[PDB]
Every structure is written in C-alpha cells, then in structure tokens.
Amino acid sequence: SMTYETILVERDQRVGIITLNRPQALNALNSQVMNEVTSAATELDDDPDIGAIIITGSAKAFAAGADIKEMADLTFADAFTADFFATWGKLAAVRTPTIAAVAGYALGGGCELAMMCDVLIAADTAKFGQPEIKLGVLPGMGGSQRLTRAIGKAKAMDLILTGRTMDAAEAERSGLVSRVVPADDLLTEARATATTISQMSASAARMAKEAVNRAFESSLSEGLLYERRLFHSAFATEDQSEGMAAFIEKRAPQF
Amino acid sequence: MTYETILVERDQRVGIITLNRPQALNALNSQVMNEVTSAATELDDDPDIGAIIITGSAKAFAAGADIKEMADLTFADAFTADFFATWGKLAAVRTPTIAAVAGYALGGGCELAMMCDVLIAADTAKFGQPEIKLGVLPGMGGSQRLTRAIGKAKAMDLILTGRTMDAAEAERSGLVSRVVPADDLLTEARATATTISQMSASAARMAKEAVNRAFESSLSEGLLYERRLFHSAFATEDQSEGMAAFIEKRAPQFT
Amino acid sequence: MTYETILVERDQRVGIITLNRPQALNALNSQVMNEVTSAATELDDDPDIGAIIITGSAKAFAAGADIKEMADLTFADAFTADFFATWGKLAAVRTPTIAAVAGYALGGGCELAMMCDVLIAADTAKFGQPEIKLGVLPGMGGSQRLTRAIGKAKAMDLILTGRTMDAAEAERSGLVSRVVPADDLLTEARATATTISQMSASAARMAKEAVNRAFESSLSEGLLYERRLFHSAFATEDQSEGMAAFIEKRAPQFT
Ligand SMILES: CC(=O)CC(=O)SCCNC(=O)CCNC(=O)[C@H](O)C(C)(C)COP(=O)(O)OP(=O)(O)OC[C@H]1O[C@@H](n2cnc3c(N)ncnc32)[C@H](O)[C@@H]1OP(=O)(O)O
C-alpha cells in the first residue's frame, strides 16, 4: 500500500510522482523521508505500469537541508553501526528513469537528492547548495562526488568549502541541471518530460540509463565496450523490432 | 583513392574527409564506417599530413544511421560481426582530428563528431541521440562521450528523451570547441587544421595522447603519464628548436 | 624561511603566497616550485592557518614555466630530476588553497592555478596551454586538469592550438570558481579565504579530500569513501559544536 507520513505519491499513466510533504520543516530530509522515498521509488520501479518517476517538493523548497536534530548527538559508533545515509543508495539502484523537479531550496541532502536523479528540471527559483561545512561536517549523501563530477572542481570546491548557493541560471550552464523552466511551469514541464520518457520502450530506456551511468564507473575504453554489448543485446528484444518497424511505418510504437 | 561514400582532399599538411551521401543526408552505414576509417588511417600514416578534418554538407554533417542495417539484425549477427566496433579505428588515429560540423549531427553523426579531438560547429549545428525512440540505445559511444562532455543531467535528458541541442547550448555545455557562422565553417576549420598541422608532429601526437589519458585512468595516473611524455619530448629536435625560437624571439622552424 | 622568488604573509588564519619574479612575469622555475611547495607545506602544518592563497602580480599570475631553464635540458636531466614532480607536494597540502588569478595564467601558470582548490579570476585573466609550439606539451598536469575541467573538445582546442581563453569563457566552461573585477581580486580572495579559514579546520580538510576523490576512482568508490569520512566527522568536537550552534541559532565556536 502507498500511504506515507512524510511524502505523497500519485500514479498517473506510466508516470509516478513522489512529492516531499514536510511543510513545517521546508521539506528537510530526515531518516523517515529517506526510508519512505526509497520505499516508494523501489515499489514504482518494480511496478511494470510505471516508466518514469518524478521526485519533487513544494514551490518554496525541493528540500531545504536535513533534520540536524537527528544528527546532532549521533556518535561515530551509531554512524558506523547504522551506516547512516547508506539507504539512499537504494534510490540509485532504481532501474526506471527518475526526474528531479526542483523548485526553491535544494540544500545539503536536498541538493544531493536532486543529483541522484537521472534528469534534473529546475524552476528559475531553484537554489542549490551544500552548506554542511558550516555545521562542522561535509556532504554525506554523495555531494562531494556528484557535484564535482557535474560542475568541475573549481565550482564544487567553492560551494562545498564556502557553502555559497548557486541559482538556477548558474546551475544550468555549469552542468548541474538538464533545463530551467519558469516556476509556475515546473510541475507541468516535469510531467511532460516524464511522459515522453515513460512512453519510451521500458527496456531500451533502462539500458540507456544504465549505459550513461557507466560513464562514471570505469575508463572510457570499458564504457565503450559495455555500451556496445548492451546495444547488441537490445536487438534480442521485441521492443527494438517494434520500434524500428514503427519508424519505417511512420507511426507510434506499441510496446 | 576512389571512395563510394566519401571524398578525400589533401591541402599542404591537412587532409579532409568529406561525407558524400547527399541522397541520404550523410547518414552513416557500414560502408561509410569502413571508408572513413580506411581513409583516416591512410592519412594518419602519411608523414606529410599533420591534421585531419572530417566534415559533411551544409545541411547535415551526418543526419543519423541507416535504419535498413539495423531493422532485421539479431543479437547473434551483431555479436559475431561486433557491429560498430570498426569505428574504434578512428580513435586509434594518432594525428589530431577536427570535426567540422554543420546542421544535422544526429545519432551516429553526433557520435562521429564526439570521436574527433577538436569540434568546430557551424551556428546551424544540431546535436542529438534519438536511438531511444527506435527502441535501442547509442551504439557508437554516445552514452560515454556525451556524458563526459556535458554532465549527467543533460546527457540523461538528451539520451532518454531524444531532444536536440543547438550549437550555442553545445558550446556552453562542453560538447564543442568553438561556434562559427555557417558560411565560415570550412574556412575556420582549415585555419585551425593549418595551425595544428604546422606544429611539431610528434609534440601534437603526444599532446593529443596525453589529453586522451584523462578519460582512461585516475588523475594520479594521468599526471604521471603526462610528465613521462613531457620528459620524452626532450629527446626530440623539435623541443630544442621550439624553445630556442622563444628565447631568440623568432618563429620556430619545425622539421 | 627567507625566499628569493616568493612573498609569504600570514593574517589571522589566512596565509598568502605571492609569486615574485616580476622581471619574468612570474615564470615558474625550479626555485619557484621548491619555494611555493615549501611555503605551502609550512603553512599546511601550522594549526593557526586555515586557508592558503596563491597569487601573482596584477599583470601575471604566471606566464608559463621558465623556458630558459628547460632549453638547458636533455632527456637525462629531465628523467633523472623527474622534472616538475615536486609540484605534487602542493597537491599533498591538506588545507584548502585558493588561486587568485590576475592577467596571464599560461602553461605552468594555468597548471598551477588548476592545482588549487578554489580558483578566483579577475575579469582581466587570460588562460592558456601554449606548450605545443615550443615543441612540447603540458608537463604540470594541464592535459589532465584542463580536460577534466572544461571537457575534451575545448581542452584539445586549447592544447593543440595554444589559443587563449578569457576569464568569462573559463567561468562558463568549468575552469574558474568566480570572476571578479581586477581591482577587487585580492579583496575578494581574502574574503573567500577568511570564510574558509573560519570553518572547522577538520571539516574543511575532510570536505576538500572528499572532493578530490571524485577524480581518483569510480563513483561507487567515491560515494563510499565520502560516507565513511562523514561518519568519522561525528567523532570530532567541531561536528558537535557546529550542529549545536545551528539548533541554538547562534554562532559556532570551533576549537
Ligand atoms: C609545465 C608546463 O606545462 C611547461 C611550461 O608551462 S611551457 C611555458 C610556455 N610559455 C609560453 O609560451 C608563453 C611565455 N610568455 C609569453 O609568451 C609572453 O611573455 C606573454 C604573451 C605572456 C606576454 O609578453 P609581453 O607582455 O610582451 O612581455 P615579455 O617581454 O614577453 O616578458 C617579459 C620578460 O619575462 C620573460 N618571460 C615571459 N614568460 C617566460 C617563461 N614562460 N619562461 C622564462 N622567461 C619568460 C621574457 O623573456 C622577458 O624577459 P627577457 O626579454 O629579458 O628574456
């Protein structure tokens, strides 16, 4: 069953939407959000009727940081024993394409959540940052890894060491976001994008996303070989036949 | 010397390979693949060539791939032939290569452009990977090279939705070296090719090889490799010449 | 220590290294390499320093490594000395470094800037890797750091042609953190340095190190490394203080 305390979930067509729902805390991420979001994403992933997954917050904040109260008295013993934050890894293991729709504050864990998704659509109001340094820690949800890989060392060092924010426009030309859309149009644009992707062959889309993810896990030489073999294997799927046949017959595919 | 799908011109120390299938918008197929790599190799081995341009028409650099060769392809066939692997001969070219890209560079075409070292784009250039729409995925390194060029967010967007990207976006995203007016594309490409071909051959070959290392190993290994190459250059006449010329406040004469 | 080629000053928790060969536009010779790395190491080891700035004159950050010194090299001198390897000492510096670049940052100068964590550019700054055309190639990590920063197409362009990149192009390409007016460069860098040095020293060191991992291994390994480092920060006083301060809406007192 799909009822959660900190999030809302809507299934429409082949698109699933995970809305962060903690207005009282500006959508701050806590242990329960981690567990609810990953559980939801995972269920949507196993659902053969779902072809794209959106993660979003409110117009005010995608997710403005984390509950510092959960972390405040945590010791290294509790941290190592619980493997604090490791559960977020379950989001990255989702095979179906994911879309972060980001309005307002995407800070700390919030910025890192956005970066875990495959596609990142931002409102013009979106503000990205990693202020963990200010709290005497550092990013714990992959920020030092994905940010640096997206925007380059100079900018990632700047944000992570000073804690400054980056607005939608800068994020777009720096490599962080896919596209910037007007604040009022965010949810509509994200659903439109999610629709397009969810209407692709589920198999082909899963493979493409997988191939892209390899670009960060090995040398180019190995990524090229992996992509080529995956490509070869797609010719064993019926969706490639239907897809190419649809192209020839100049029609919509029926996967 | 005579090719069915391409034209080859030599001008001084610059070789130019021009895709030549107007009737098909310079779409790639097995023949184009065999001919381009055959021509490029041959130019690579010619001591009187120091730079190679690959270009298409003003409307299409290469508008995609031939759907015919893929429509009834089985996994067994693709695996046995190692379909597309031959494009790897282009990467093995030691001499610097310049893709001069006008108009359409889609699917395989976009991938062809990404294989070159330098990419000069007409202001008319459109890039994209529409493989997903046909129920397959990039098979010529697109998911590897695009992602490394322009970051995850935008590569995922392009590869999963098939959306096009104009020349200006490509320039600020990391995909292209420079954007020039369409009428000036070929002229500008030859100027660049001329410049590169008049550098020391061995030094340009070491420089290209070093840059290529950046995608094949850790930074600490890449650093060691570059430094060793750099040291090696001191066993060439061209380094002594180039450095004497700076000190003597003159133009170098590489031989 | 007394230095012949640099100037060092300490102010609060900020150390500043000024390249001081004005007669050679701060060309980077072996003596500069040794002194900069010695000064940086000394500053790194001083518990009263929390950030380090490296800068040149308003006319040049550094206009290449010293060509006169290099003309005097055989392959044997270079291999035996492991020419340029000592610059690695600067990468071993745990404390955050900020390159404040005005005017010329060419070859070794551009490379030195890229070695630093944060890069602040005057609007007047010019970047380049013109080593080619001395009949050599970058020897201080240029082929590695530039390529990872700005993508293949532009790094090949710059490295094979020797063309210059203005500060504005560098900022949108991935090379620089921020661009500021030439008159405000030293002021802006000091502000950034101050911000960074007033952070928890251990947090900053961890964060910087985490970010540096993004170039040394796969994403999955970088992710794990970060999380372990994040857990270990909960064994530090500063984590406890940094977070208690935030909850209590006050200013942190790091020890
Ligand atoms: C580690 C690596 O990867 C390898 C190295 O970086 S390769 C270094 C390659 N460097 C370059 O090609 C450019 C070097 N410098 C220049 O081209 C020019 O100085 C410039 C374009 C930066 C501006 O020149 P300018 O404003 O007209 O003044 P200019 O007269 O050239 O320089 C002033 C003095 O500093 C010297 N100088 C400038 N750059 C130098 C360098 N990289 N090495 C040794 N001396 C240098 C000049 O020779 C001159 O002194 P002398 O006439 O007495 O010999």
Side-chain angles (χ1 to χ4, degrees), chain A residues 3-126 128-255, chain B residues 3-66 69-236 238-254, chain C residues 3 5-254:
Chain A
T3 305
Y4 306 93
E5 277 156 36
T6 76
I7 64 168
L8 306 167
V9 178
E10 160 177 8
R11 290 169 197 90
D12 192 28
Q13 220 77 62
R14 287 183 61 71
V15 178
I17 307 90
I18 298 168
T19 299
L20 302 184
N21 194 31
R22 292 185 80 219
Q24 72 280 15
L26 276 143
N27 282 331
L29 308 175
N30 66 17
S31 273
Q32 185 170 39
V33 180
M34 174 181 70
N35 285 307
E36 291 185 338
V37 171
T38 56
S39 282
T42 300
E43 284 207 14
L44 269 5
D45 196 35
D46 296 334
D47 188 346
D49 289 327
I50 299 301
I53 299 164
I54 292 161
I55 304 179
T56 199
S58 74
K60 199 169 176 186
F62 179 72
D67 273 11
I68 306 314
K69 295 185 178 172
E70 295 204 335
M71 293 186 287
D73 299 286
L74 207 62
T75 46
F76 170 76
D78 310 333
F80 183 77
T81 288
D83 210 342
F84 198 73
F85 283 157
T87 294
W88 279 114
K90 282 180 173 193
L91 185 47
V94 163
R95 300 179 65 191
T96 293
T98 59
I99 322 285
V102 174
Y105 300 84
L107 306 173
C111 185
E112 290 162 295
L113 176 57
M115 291 186 291
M116 286 174 197
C117 297
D118 307 299
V119 172
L120 205 180
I121 303 162
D124 40 28
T125 61
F128 297 96
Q130 305 283 165
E132 286 87 343
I133 185 69
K134 288 174 143 78
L135 307 170
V137 294
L138 67 149
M141 286 171 52
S144 67
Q145 301 312 304
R146 289 188 181 92
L147 192 72
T148 311
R149 281 172 174 89
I151 68 180
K153 188 181 68 167
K155 291 200 165 185
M157 282 292 196
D158 187 17
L159 273 63
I160 289 161
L161 303 185
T162 71
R164 81 162 179 87
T165 76
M166 169 186 292
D167 64 14
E170 192 188 351
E172 192 278 345
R173 68 184 180 269
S174 301
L176 183 61
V177 310
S178 312
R179 21 201 163 97
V180 174
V181 300
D184 297 296
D185 295 341
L186 178 62
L187 264 33
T188 314
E189 225 77 22
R191 280 275 252 279
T193 287
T195 282
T196 303
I197 302 184
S198 74
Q199 281 172 5
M200 301 301 181
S201 153
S203 213
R206 279 173 163 199
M207 283 178 177
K209 147 158 173 178
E210 192 174 79
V212 171
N213 278 326
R214 308 271 66 63
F216 306 110
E217 308 291 350
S218 66
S219 64
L220 175 62
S221 193
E222 289 300 302
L224 297 173
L225 178 63
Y226 187 95
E227 186 207 79
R228 181 164 65 258
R229 286 282 173 274
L230 203 49
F231 178 71
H232 289 169
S233 79
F235 293 97
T237 70
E238 216 143 313
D239 280 359
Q240 82 89 5
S241 281
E242 168 53 13
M244 253 147 253
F247 174 69
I248 291 157
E249 301 171 34
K250 302 180 172 58
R251 65 174 170 79
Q254 290 225 15
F255 303 118
Chain B
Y3 293 97
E4 281 196 40
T5 65
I6 66 175
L7 304 159
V8 172
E9 191 196 338
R10 297 161 150 81
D11 170 56
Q12 308 274 72
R13 283 180 61 66
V14 175
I16 311 87
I17 298 168
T18 302
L19 305 204
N20 195 40
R21 302 175 77 215
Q23 260 288 137
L25 282 186
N26 287 333
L28 312 182
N29 59 31
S30 277
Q31 201 171 6
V32 180
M33 172 195 296
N34 287 318
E35 295 193 336
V36 169
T37 56
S38 277
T41 300
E42 201 270 336
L43 292 162
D44 200 29
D45 290 329
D46 188 349
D48 303 311
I49 304 299
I52 294 163
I53 298 162
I54 297 173
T55 200
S57 81
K59 211 211 178 182
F61 174 83
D66 244 296
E69 294 184 5
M70 287 183 223
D72 301 302
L73 197 67
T74 68
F75 166 70
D77 302 322
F79 177 72
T80 276
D82 214 349
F83 194 76
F84 285 156
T86 299
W87 279 113
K89 282 189 195 263
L90 187 47
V93 165
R94 300 173 72 191
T95 290
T97 61
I98 301 105
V101 172
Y104 286 124
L106 311 176
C110 181
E111 286 166 299
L112 177 50
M114 294 190 291
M115 291 175 188
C116 305
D117 312 305
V118 175
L119 203 177
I120 294 166
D123 54 15
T124 57
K126 276 195 163 188
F127 302 89
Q129 304 283 167
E131 284 88 1
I132 187 69
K133 276 140 170 177
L134 293 217
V136 287
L137 65 141
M140 282 170 63
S143 73
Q144 298 313 298
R145 292 194 178 83
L146 189 72
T147 309
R148 284 171 168 88
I150 74 176
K152 190 182 69 161
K154 289 195 165 176
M156 285 291 196
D157 185 23
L158 266 59
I159 284 158
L160 300 170
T161 77
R163 82 151 167 102
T164 291
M165 170 193 274
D166 65 48
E169 189 185 357
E171 192 280 336
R172 63 171 199 274
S173 295
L175 186 54
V176 310
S177 306
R178 279 177 279 121
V179 175
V180 298
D183 293 347
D184 300 332
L185 175 60
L186 295 175
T187 300
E188 278 279 13
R190 275 162 182 280
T192 298
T194 289
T195 300
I196 297 168
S197 65
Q198 289 166 354
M199 303 292 185
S200 165
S202 60
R205 282 179 163 198
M206 293 186 277
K208 156 173 180 161
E209 178 171 285
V211 167
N212 274 336
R213 243 65 269 130
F215 311 103
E216 299 301 342
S217 63
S218 61
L219 170 65
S220 62
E221 286 305 297
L223 290 172
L224 176 61
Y225 192 96
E226 187 210 79
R227 187 167 66 256
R228 286 295 168 262
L229 264 194
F230 175 79
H231 293 168
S232 273
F234 292 87
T236 74
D238 285 342
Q239 72 89 13
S240 282
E241 166 59 20
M243 287 179 181
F246 170 88
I247 300 164
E248 292 163 24
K249 311 263 194 182
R250 59 175 179 84
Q253 309 177 68
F254 302 117
Chain C
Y3 301 108
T5 65
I6 63 173
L7 305 173
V8 185
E9 79 153 290
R10 298 168 186 80
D11 181 36
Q12 311 284 349
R13 297 185 48 71
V14 176
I16 305 92
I17 297 176
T18 308
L19 305 184
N20 200 38
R21 299 186 69 228
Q23 77 290 0
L25 301 175
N26 297 330
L28 307 177
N29 67 5
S30 284
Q31 186 174 18
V32 174
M33 177 182 63
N34 287 319
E35 294 189 331
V36 170
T37 57
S38 294
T41 300
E42 204 228 72
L43 293 177
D44 191 34
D45 288 330
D46 172 23
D48 287 336
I49 304 297
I52 296 167
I53 294 161
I54 302 187
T55 195
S57 70
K59 181 165 182 182
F61 178 78
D66 194 297
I67 291 143
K68 295 165 176 196
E69 196 196 356
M70 295 188 280
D72 286 316
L73 295 173
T74 69
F75 173 68
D77 298 67
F79 178 73
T80 279
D82 208 340
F83 204 79
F84 289 145
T86 300
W87 279 114
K89 280 199 51 193
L90 181 53
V93 170
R94 308 181 62 189
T95 295
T97 57
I98 299 99
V101 173
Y104 293 114
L106 302 176
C110 182
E111 287 166 300
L112 171 61
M114 288 188 292
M115 290 176 196
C116 301
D117 309 307
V118 173
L119 198 177
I120 305 306
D123 51 30
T124 206
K126 293 186 95 54
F127 293 93
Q129 295 290 166
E131 285 80 0
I132 195 62
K133 91 178 164 180
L134 295 183
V136 292
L137 65 144
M140 278 165 59
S143 68
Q144 305 307 304
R145 290 192 178 92
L146 191 67
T147 306
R148 290 171 166 83
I150 73 175
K152 187 184 80 169
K154 278 174 141 82
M156 288 283 191
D157 189 27
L158 265 68
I159 288 172
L160 300 170
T161 70
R163 80 149 176 106
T164 293
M165 182 183 283
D166 63 44
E169 196 196 349
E171 190 281 343
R172 46 193 192 75
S173 294
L175 185 60
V176 325
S177 314
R178 286 181 277 115
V179 170
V180 302
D183 290 347
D184 304 324
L185 178 66
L186 265 10
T187 299
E188 288 291 320
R190 293 278 230 121
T192 305
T194 288
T195 293
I196 292 176
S197 64
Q198 292 181 342
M199 298 300 181
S200 162
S202 59
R205 282 176 168 210
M206 293 190 174
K208 162 174 164 161
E209 187 179 75
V211 169
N212 277 332
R213 307 275 64 62
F215 310 107
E216 309 291 342
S217 66
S218 68
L219 181 48
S220 61
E221 290 299 298
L223 257 15
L224 174 62
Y225 184 98
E226 188 203 79
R227 186 163 68 256
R228 287 295 171 259
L229 209 63
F230 177 76
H231 295 163
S232 76
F234 289 90
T236 70
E237 290 290 328
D238 289 339
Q239 165 276 313
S240 193
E241 165 61 9
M243 289 191 173
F246 175 95
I247 299 169
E248 299 165 12
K249 301 206 192 70
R250 56 167 175 86
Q253 287 169 302
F254 297 123

